[PDB]
Amino acid sequence: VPDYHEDIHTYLREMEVKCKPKVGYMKKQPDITNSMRAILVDWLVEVGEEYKLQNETLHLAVNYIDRFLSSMSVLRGKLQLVGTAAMLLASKFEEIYPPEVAEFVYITDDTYTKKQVLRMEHLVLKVLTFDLAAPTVNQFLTQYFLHQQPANCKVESLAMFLGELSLIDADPYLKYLPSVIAGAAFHLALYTVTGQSWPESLIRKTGYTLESLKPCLMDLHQTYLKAPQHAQQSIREKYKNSKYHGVSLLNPPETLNL
Amino acid sequence: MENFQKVEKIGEGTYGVVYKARNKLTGEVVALKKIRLDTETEGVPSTAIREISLLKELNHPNIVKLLDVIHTENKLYLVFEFLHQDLKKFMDASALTGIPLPLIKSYLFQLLQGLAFCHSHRVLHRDLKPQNLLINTEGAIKLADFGLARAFGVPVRTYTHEVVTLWYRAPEILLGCKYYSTAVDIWSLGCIFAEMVTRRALFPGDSEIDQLFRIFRTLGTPDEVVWPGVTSMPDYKPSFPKWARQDFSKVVPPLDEDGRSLLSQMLHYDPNKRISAKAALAHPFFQDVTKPVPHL
Amino acid sequence: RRXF
Ligand SMILES: Cc1nc(N)sc1-c1ccnc(Nc2cccc([N+](=O)[O-])c2)n1
């Protein structure tokens, strides 16, 4: 009940700082790259589609991956094992019933055994110290959607699209807290669909002016402009569905009027 | 685990058996929950995943404290503060005489405090029942078993096949709402409030339709006036019988005007108008609240 | 799909 809207938002603002990954961790990974991470996240987008997982599950899994890779060095042959265990754990946390473990073996073309997946599960729980209720972009967007005048389903869908795109590219998006990315995604989506702008009601609530969102927004604008040429295309394909009003078929604005 | 001596089994929770144990080094008595763990096939169950992550976030006098997690290759143990009894078993033992009204008031007050804290931290318990409510000798009551609890940073989608409990289930779930809200927990607590007062379950249904219908016979069959939207909910049927709302002086005789008023507000049909835990704490029924101790 |  809207009695807790404020309390929840304020509390999510507090927890997103605690569940934050280290920004420069890929530099300290000797065997893996942003580009590998990008391939991994893109693959997980597709897996969530195949298995009809909720979008929050994807967002959670990525949070778990980046926090894991912030303290644990991983060889390129095991990065997929990490991702797979992350997706299993996220599904357990978020889904009504998760896919069976066997499904998580199959999705890798049986490159790992069931036992390897399960013991990577254990290791990920250990490193994350069982702290799995991480705030996500998708949570902040969902709360921001209560402030549309009036609610517009292209705006929502496009904001979700932009939110997910940001999961793919560690540089730049690891620099920004989820509430900030959600802020930029919402404005850019609203702007793209209607020409309107980050509402004062959300400026009061988040304490974010449009100007404070500008660095993240310029990044997100470039990402949106360059989305059709990006090596990774799963999110674009996903958001072509009628479910989402084709938003990823709408044309991005060549300027932000900033 | 070397520093714990199991004393005796005290119960079971969601996918784990609960033991009374003592720390051999410090002397502290704890409740140890040993998770049912299948290391080859399914891994750590989703109940333990949720209970651990959510309870680590929740530090409040009326929520059971997780002291430690002991996670080895083939075993998972959760260490909790020890509490002496559950509410179900206390009211079984207080049948005949009844739980004294002042103690009922105290427990409700405290449960509302723990619930309010959960909700303000985006946690839905989802399975409030007396068996999950724990009491100590000093008069405290605490929420326990967060195995079915969910974080609602995004709205929680209802289960096609509900595993939760029939008797304390909200009418919006039974009529097929798409999402839970914090109101489902208020509804359960309202049922537990009435149950302490009258010494029996308010709505003891034997199935889903019978559960709805037992609610309808006491509260009256809902309509658009009382619950806008109800007639176009997925499992609503125009052939539902029409029962009259009962006077709450008949439903809960012992309870005074303030108690009847709070109850009816906790059992409001429309989840959007059902009173919140925070608001319920401001109700005049808790003006004269005290902290008596139970006879265990 | 096997993946790097
Ligand atoms: C963590 C936990 N989950 C439960 N479910 S019960 C439980 C717990 C925690 C602390 N103390 C107790 N003690 C206790 C005493 C008496 C009865 C019951 N019960 O399980 O039936 C429990 N139980």
XYZ file of C-alpha atoms in Angstrom, chain A residues 48-216:
169
model
C 15.410 -15.523 -20.027
C 13.403 -15.307 -23.210
C 13.601 -19.013 -23.999
C 12.508 -19.934 -20.464
C 10.013 -17.036 -20.094
C 11.762 -15.600 -17.070
C 10.879 -12.229 -15.596
C 13.043 -9.287 -16.521
C 13.951 -8.728 -12.827
C 15.616 -12.153 -12.848
C 18.016 -11.014 -15.598
C 18.793 -7.806 -13.708
C 19.456 -9.702 -10.507
C 21.731 -12.259 -12.230
C 23.874 -9.473 -13.677
C 24.192 -7.814 -10.310
C 25.342 -11.137 -8.877
C 27.896 -11.646 -11.677
C 29.511 -8.219 -11.362
C 29.791 -8.463 -7.558
C 31.263 -11.969 -7.862
C 33.845 -10.801 -10.448
C 34.720 -7.854 -8.186
C 36.504 -10.230 -5.720
C 37.066 -13.472 -7.607
C 39.424 -13.971 -10.548
C 37.891 -16.178 -13.175
C 39.340 -17.805 -16.271
C 37.445 -17.364 -19.581
C 36.493 -21.072 -19.595
C 34.623 -20.681 -16.302
C 32.920 -17.289 -16.860
C 29.910 -19.050 -18.327
C 29.773 -21.272 -15.202
C 29.601 -18.140 -13.100
C 26.792 -16.690 -15.235
C 24.810 -19.905 -15.171
C 24.955 -20.180 -11.385
C 23.993 -16.481 -11.118
C 20.924 -17.065 -13.304
C 19.941 -20.159 -11.233
C 20.204 -18.160 -8.005
C 18.291 -15.193 -9.423
C 15.546 -17.533 -10.630
C 15.334 -19.120 -7.211
C 15.008 -15.665 -5.594
C 12.604 -14.123 -8.053
C 10.641 -16.824 -9.974
C 7.536 -18.616 -8.728
C 9.233 -21.805 -9.610
C 12.707 -21.783 -11.171
C 13.789 -24.001 -14.032
C 15.286 -27.274 -12.755
C 19.061 -27.449 -12.366
C 19.258 -29.787 -15.385
C 17.907 -26.939 -17.523
C 20.907 -24.833 -16.479
C 23.253 -27.603 -17.571
C 21.487 -27.937 -20.940
C 21.615 -24.197 -21.751
C 25.426 -24.355 -21.784
C 25.312 -27.299 -24.222
C 26.446 -29.517 -21.321
C 29.860 -27.878 -21.047
C 29.526 -28.209 -17.235
C 28.097 -30.931 -15.028
C 25.134 -30.568 -12.685
C 27.538 -30.892 -9.782
C 29.767 -28.074 -11.085
C 26.765 -25.775 -11.413
C 25.640 -26.630 -7.863
C 28.994 -26.092 -6.368
C 29.398 -22.832 -8.204
C 26.007 -21.929 -6.699
C 27.446 -22.587 -3.246
C 30.538 -20.506 -4.023
C 28.478 -17.560 -5.312
C 26.326 -17.613 -2.159
C 29.524 -17.627 -0.073
C 31.078 -14.631 -1.909
C 27.850 -12.622 -1.971
C 27.386 -13.617 1.704
C 23.785 -14.573 0.861
C 22.918 -10.946 0.109
C 20.728 -11.473 -2.969
C 17.922 -8.853 -2.554
C 19.770 -6.227 -4.619
C 17.906 -3.154 -5.940
C 17.828 -3.045 -9.762
C 17.256 -0.594 -12.584
C 13.991 -2.481 -13.207
C 12.846 -1.866 -9.600
C 13.584 1.883 -9.767
C 11.844 2.182 -13.166
C 8.831 0.299 -11.824
C 8.567 2.794 -8.950
C 9.147 5.789 -11.279
C 6.264 4.586 -13.495
C 3.841 5.540 -10.695
C 4.582 9.193 -11.640
C 3.399 9.236 -15.283
C 0.729 11.852 -16.158
C -0.880 9.860 -17.671
C 0.631 6.348 -17.888
C 1.959 5.525 -21.362
C 2.871 1.992 -22.254
C 5.343 2.856 -25.060
C 7.194 4.999 -22.552
C 7.323 2.123 -20.072
C 8.415 -0.467 -22.630
C 11.085 1.801 -24.139
C 12.401 2.659 -20.674
C 12.706 -1.067 -19.933
C 14.564 -1.532 -23.237
C 17.041 1.197 -22.410
C 17.452 -0.128 -18.890
C 18.382 -3.591 -20.255
C 20.778 -2.200 -22.853
C 22.765 -0.724 -20.009
C 23.350 -4.219 -18.557
C 25.468 -5.169 -21.577
C 28.225 -2.561 -21.342
C 30.221 -2.444 -18.087
C 32.073 0.631 -19.443
C 30.322 3.080 -18.959
C 27.329 1.777 -16.971
C 29.126 0.377 -13.899
C 29.872 4.033 -13.002
C 26.215 4.739 -12.216
C 23.901 3.563 -9.455
C 20.663 1.845 -10.620
C 18.443 4.794 -9.552
C 20.488 7.080 -11.855
C 20.319 4.713 -14.860
C 16.560 4.354 -14.221
C 16.290 8.150 -14.119
C 18.074 8.536 -17.465
C 16.141 5.668 -19.011
C 12.805 7.142 -17.987
C 13.554 10.679 -19.267
C 15.007 9.439 -22.539
C 12.024 7.108 -23.034
C 9.525 9.888 -22.183
C 11.413 12.336 -24.392
C 11.663 9.896 -27.279
C 7.918 9.059 -27.263
C 6.309 12.432 -26.408
C 9.012 15.162 -26.239
C 8.268 15.551 -22.511
C 10.830 15.676 -19.765
C 11.913 14.234 -16.377
C 8.891 15.341 -14.229
C 9.175 17.692 -11.209
C 7.431 15.076 -9.081
C 10.370 12.760 -9.729
C 12.796 15.617 -9.149
C 11.258 16.121 -5.693
C 11.186 12.382 -4.895
C 14.626 11.295 -6.176
C 16.299 14.606 -5.451
C 17.702 14.228 -8.994
C 17.525 17.281 -11.269
C 17.691 16.621 -15.007
C 21.099 18.295 -14.988
C 22.492 15.708 -12.468
C 21.245 12.949 -14.841
C 23.080 14.483 -17.816
C 26.295 12.450 -17.719
C 24.406 9.115 -17.591
